[PDB]
Design an enzyme around this catalytic site. Structure first.
Site, PDB file in Angstrom:
ATOM      1  N   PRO B  22       0.819  -1.191   0.000  1.00  0.00           N
ATOM      2  CA  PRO B  22       0.000   0.000   0.000  1.00  0.00           C
ATOM      3  C   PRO B  22       0.862   1.253   0.000  1.00  0.00           C
ATOM      4  CG  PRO B  22       0.051  -1.051   2.172  1.00  0.00           C
ATOM      5  CD  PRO B  22       0.615  -2.027   1.191  1.00  0.00           C
ATOM      6  N   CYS B  24      -0.088   5.307  -0.108  1.00  0.00           N
ATOM      7  CA  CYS B  24      -0.929   6.507  -0.148  1.00  0.00           C
ATOM      8  C   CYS B  24      -0.512   7.435  -1.289  1.00  0.00           C
ATOM      9  CB  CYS B  24      -0.808   7.244   1.169  1.00  0.00           C
ATOM     10  SG  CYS B  24      -1.761   6.536   2.498  1.00  0.00           S
ATOM     11  N   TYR B 182      -0.488   4.154  13.723  1.00  0.00           N
ATOM     12  CA  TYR B 182      -1.881   4.493  13.561  1.00  0.00           C
ATOM     13  C   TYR B 182      -2.719   3.780  14.631  1.00  0.00           C
ATOM     14  CZ  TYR B 182       0.044   6.277   9.201  1.00  0.00           C
ATOM     15  OH  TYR B 182       0.826   6.906   8.244  1.00  0.00           O
ATOM     16  N   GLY B 324       7.961  -1.014  -3.098  1.00  0.00           N
ATOM     17  CA  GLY B 324       7.161   0.197  -3.095  1.00  0.00           C
ATOM     18  C   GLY B 324       7.695   1.294  -3.994  1.00  0.00           C
ATOM     19  N   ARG B 325       8.668   2.038  -3.515  1.00  0.00           N
ATOM     20  CA  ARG B 325       9.134   3.206  -4.257  1.00  0.00           C
ATOM     21  C   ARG B 325       9.639   2.909  -5.637  1.00  0.00           C
ATOM     22  NH1 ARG B 325      12.306   5.683   0.674  1.00  0.00           N
ATOM     23  NH2 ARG B 325      12.433   3.413   1.031  1.00  0.00           N
TER      24      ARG B 325
HETATM   25  C1  LIG Z   1       4.261   7.163  -1.231  1.00  0.00           C
HETATM   26  C2  LIG Z   1       4.224   6.169  -0.045  1.00  0.00           C
HETATM   27  C3  LIG Z   1       3.061   5.958   0.551  1.00  0.00           C
HETATM   28  C4  LIG Z   1       2.917   4.898   1.578  1.00  0.00           C
HETATM   29  N1  LIG Z   1       1.667   4.671   2.067  1.00  0.00           N
HETATM   30  C5  LIG Z   1       1.581   3.515   2.891  1.00  0.00           C
HETATM   31  C6  LIG Z   1       0.353   3.041   3.117  1.00  0.00           C
HETATM   32  O1  LIG Z   1      -0.747   3.421   2.632  1.00  0.00           O
HETATM   33  N2  LIG Z   1       0.298   2.004   4.084  1.00  0.00           N
HETATM   34  C7  LIG Z   1       1.399   1.421   4.565  1.00  0.00           C
HETATM   35  O2  LIG Z   1       1.263   0.462   5.388  1.00  0.00           O
HETATM   36  N3  LIG Z   1       2.627   1.822   4.193  1.00  0.00           N
HETATM   37  C8  LIG Z   1       2.697   2.857   3.308  1.00  0.00           C
HETATM   38  N4  LIG Z   1       3.926   3.123   2.885  1.00  0.00           N
HETATM   39  C9  LIG Z   1       5.135   2.264   3.100  1.00  0.00           C
HETATM   40  C10 LIG Z   1       5.339   1.374   1.979  1.00  0.00           C
HETATM   41  O3  LIG Z   1       4.310   0.413   1.862  1.00  0.00           O
HETATM   42  C11 LIG Z   1       6.680   0.605   2.062  1.00  0.00           C
HETATM   43  O4  LIG Z   1       6.696  -0.231   3.262  1.00  0.00           O
HETATM   44  C12 LIG Z   1       7.958   1.449   2.052  1.00  0.00           C
HETATM   45  O5  LIG Z   1       7.835   2.476   1.038  1.00  0.00           O
HETATM   46  C13 LIG Z   1       9.211   0.738   1.969  1.00  0.00           C
HETATM   47  O6  LIG Z   1       9.341  -0.028   0.808  1.00  0.00           O
HETATM   48  P1  LIG Z   1      10.254   0.525  -0.443  1.00  0.00           P
HETATM   49  O7  LIG Z   1      11.693   0.728   0.035  1.00  0.00           O
HETATM   50  O8  LIG Z   1      10.156  -0.519  -1.426  1.00  0.00           O
HETATM   51  O9  LIG Z   1       9.595   1.820  -0.900  1.00  0.00           O
HETATM   52  C14 LIG Z   1       4.087   4.219   1.906  1.00  0.00           C
HETATM   53  C15 LIG Z   1       5.323   4.526   1.324  1.00  0.00           C
HETATM   54  C16 LIG Z   1       5.387   5.466   0.313  1.00  0.00           C
HETATM   55  C17 LIG Z   1       6.717   5.748  -0.336  1.00  0.00           C
HETATM   56  O1  LIG Z   2       1.349   3.650   6.594  1.00  0.00           O
HETATM   57  C1  LIG Z   2       1.808   4.582   5.929  1.00  0.00           C
HETATM   58  C2  LIG Z   2       1.048   5.536   5.254  1.00  0.00           C
HETATM   59  C3  LIG Z   2       1.690   6.513   4.485  1.00  0.00           C
HETATM   60  C4  LIG Z   2       3.085   6.517   4.386  1.00  0.00           C
HETATM   61  C5  LIG Z   2       3.799   7.449   3.615  1.00  0.00           C
HETATM   62  C6  LIG Z   2       5.176   7.376   3.584  1.00  0.00           C
HETATM   63  C7  LIG Z   2       5.878   6.424   4.280  1.00  0.00           C
HETATM   64  C8  LIG Z   2       5.179   5.509   5.041  1.00  0.00           C
HETATM   65  C9  LIG Z   2       3.795   5.554   5.094  1.00  0.00           C
HETATM   66  O2  LIG Z   2       3.164   4.608   5.864  1.00  0.00           O
END
Ligand SMILES: Cc1cc2nc3c(=O)[nH]c(=O)nc-3n(C[C@H](O)[C@H](O)[C@H](O)COP(=O)(O)O)c2cc1C
Ligand SMILES: O=c1ccc2ccccc2o1
Ligand SMILES: Cc1cc2nc3c(=O)[nH]c(=O)nc-3n(C[C@H](O)[C@H](O)[C@H](O)COP(=O)(O)O)c2cc1C
Ligand SMILES: O=c1ccc2ccccc2o1
Ligand SMILES: O=c1ccc2ccccc2o1
Ligand SMILES: O=c1ccc2ccccc2o1
Lengths: 359, 359
Positions: B22, B24, B182, B324-325
């Site tokens: 997920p 956001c 949260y 994610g990213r």
């Molecule tokens: C733009 C953005 C929004 C995120 N929104 C959520 C979210 O809705 N719920 C959540 O549990 N984590 C959220 N996260 C965390 C990501 O799910 C993820 O765990 C994190 O970005 C690390 O993985 P990565 O290094 O592959 O980006 C968000 C991260 C990013 C960058």
């Molecule tokens: O659960 C979340 C929701 C949004 C979010 C944005 C950036 C990094 C982590 C995040 O985690």
């Protein structure tokens, strides 16, 4: 970087010099586009390119390349583009469209479904039309029907109707598909045009369909929006110097007739050619057309290496760089290019919900 | 390659081990998603990942993180997801959703609009709710209102309603957001939960909101579709061994209560922590949870390097790798990964209109 300088043509300003050229998706049904196209195109627009040109869109049913080709031959077909155009604009890219008629190369299978002319008894197929009753050959053996003068008038009017529809759907950039061996290219080339009426023989007569079509479209296409064409300027058929000279002359006539930019291509009019493929191989020929016709140009083939795109711009070979396959691989290629070329705040090539996190 | 082996959980089969966690987007209006989300999510699904989990989607208006957060607190909100779910399925990815309540971290600005609690007199803001009237601190100074027992019952029912709506919109995978400081995480953590009723104090009482919510959701969520949660299992607050032991115990209770997979995270319950960021840093903690609770897991943070994702799977640290990213940067990351890991016919990670040309 040159690649990330804006470009203004008529009243339209592109945010950078990256153009996404028309790329057939083969996903339409009876010419009607759908959510394949919506998501594909909106996604591309959000990736940062300054201009997104929609795939070859048929001006008439028989002018589709394949049963999966997009069409704009009725108002209902045009309406289907409205939300996509609006999504492209929402992302800050300029929406363009290539309007097309496949001529003797029509009635073919999708590329992953054989890429060849459809069998005569396949209920999907149709009779093709062309300047003369001569087949391309190779995988496209079907002999087209020789167009009558009334056919010529009708296809011209189909291009006008298509351009009018493109305008009314909100496109800000149009490209007439006079390249790649399709109808327009095939009227220009002596290989495919053996007509002995006003539409074949001399340079003036072989040019006539293309010039009349441009002029007719110009009557409905707003003067403040770029009016462009794609045109194959040589074939690599052992007649390149003569062909280039004629093609550049026609480009001069297009410019005099209100063409704002030419997308310079290879003709692909016949199969027996020897094209010297390579990264940016078209740069020198694009530059020659640009210089000798004094007309802005774009070209393509291998510019997905961002340094190549940059070099072509800096050398004034091109005004816009078209990047096709690299965008199928990565919709966000413009962001990759921005990083490669050291653009400050490169991630802001993308919209905020991406850019904020990649910075 | 391990990354491209399918995975079956309950009746759902993922085509590979790549999960898009997920993320956001902060692009919704009054909780309603729009064409931002449609194109974003459909584009991701077409990139090849086996599972796409929709961003934190609020079960109630006050449970949004920000004014741009998605919501599912009415049937009309749920309806807005139907076409997106259908587009995700059309692309062959499994549609999931994270349902959420931001608790004391709610009523905040979008990350590129200050990322902090909204000012008291800003008409967009709202009162936050939490286990106890204690602020996070730092950029989130707002003191939340301590929940009543009726508040607790209402939020639980909001999670049930959200899950029922997710089911009826066609989601095939649900994730309860019990991580990242949260509402759910904050009931578990002694830092944020000072209650002296049945919902705070002991391990059993701090677990209670989470377990009751899971059980209530289980009543409406089909047994044949994966029921999952995201949970922060340590804080990096100098209490990690004790916190991990309790979190693993709760994971055992979740499993016993029908949880199919746990997405293992960091708590982010308070700001005064020292997280040892690094590529794949969560792998060893995910592996410990997996082993000690005997439960499938995913985790994230830096797995966009495809070799890292592959190694984590081969070492049995993870069952799915969340990326994610890298997907914000390139929607077609799964194709890049396929190439990197030497998958045969790597381009057919993508649909035909891309794959045919990149092969
Ligand atoms: C733009 C953005 C929004 C995120 N929104 C959520 C979210 O809705 N719920 C959540 O549990 N984590 C959220 N996260 C965390 C990501 O799910 C993820 O765990 C994190 O970005 C690390 O993985 P990565 O290094 O592959 O980006 C968000 C991260 C990013 C960058
Ligand atoms: O659960 C979340 C929701 C949004 C979010 C944005 C950036 C990094 C982590 C995040 O985690
Ligand atoms: C999938 C695909 C479809 C194409 N469809 C068209 C098209 O509709 N009209 C056109 O003039 N050229 C079409 N072309 C050619 C491209 O516009 C472009 O000139 C070519 O792919 C070379 O650029 P590249 O190396 O960046 O891909 C297509 C190419 C591809 C790969
Ligand atoms: O004009 C066109 C139309 C389709 C197409 C497909 C692949 C390569 C080149 C093409 O050119
Ligand atoms: O680049 C963008 C920025 C915002 C936006 C909003 C809705 C749809 C598409 C969009 O694209
Ligand atoms: O992967 C795919 C393949 C086909 C398709 C058709 C319409 C919409 C989305 C699609 O995604």
């Amino acid at each position: 970087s040159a690649l990330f300088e804006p470009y203004t043509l008529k009243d339209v300003t592109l945010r950078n010099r990256i153009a996404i050229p028309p790329m057939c998706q083969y996903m339409a049904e009876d010419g009607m586009i759908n959510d394949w196209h919506h998501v594909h195109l909106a996604g591309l627009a959000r990736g940062g390119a300054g201009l997104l040109v929609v795939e070859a869109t048929a001006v008439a049913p028989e002018g589709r390349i394949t049963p999966g080709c997009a069409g704009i031959w009725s108002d209902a077909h045009a309406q289907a583009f409205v939300p996509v155009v609006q999504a492209i604009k929402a992302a800050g890219s300029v929406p363009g469209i290539q309007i097309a008629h496949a001529g003797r190369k029509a009635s073919a299978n999708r590329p992953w479904e054989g890429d060849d002319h459809i069998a005569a008894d396949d209920t999907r197929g149709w009779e093709t039309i062309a300047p003369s009753a001569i087949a391309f050959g190779a995988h496209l053996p079907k002999v087209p029907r020789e167009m009558t003068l009334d056919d010529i008038a009708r296809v011209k009017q189909d291009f006008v109707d298509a351009a009018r529809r493109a305008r009314d759907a909100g496109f800000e950039w149009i490209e007439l598909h006079f390249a790649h061996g399709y109808l327009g290219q095939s009227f220009f080339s002596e290989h495919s045009n053996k007509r002995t009426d006003a539409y074949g023989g001399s340079f003036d007569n072989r040019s006539r369909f293309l010039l009349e079509t441009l002029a007719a479209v110009r009557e409905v296409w707003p003067e403040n929006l770029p009016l462009t064409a794609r045109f194959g300027v040589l074939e690599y058929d052992g007649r390149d110097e003569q062909t280039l000279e004629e093609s550049i002359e026609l480009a001069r006539r297009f410019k005099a007739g209100g063409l704002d930019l030419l997308s310079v291509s290879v003709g692909f009019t016949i199969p027996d050619t020897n094209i010297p493929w390579g990264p940016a191989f078209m740069g020198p020929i694009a530059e020659r057309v640009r210089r000798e016709a004094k007309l802005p140009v774009t070209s393509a083939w291998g510019f997905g290496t961002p340094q190549l795109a940059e070099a072509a711009l800096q050398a004034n070979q091109l005004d816009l760089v078209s990047v096709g396959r690299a965008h199928l691989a990565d919709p966000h290629w413009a962001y990759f290019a921005a990083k490669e070329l050291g653009v400050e705040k490169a991630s802001w090539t993308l919209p905020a919900p991406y850019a904020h996190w990649l910075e």
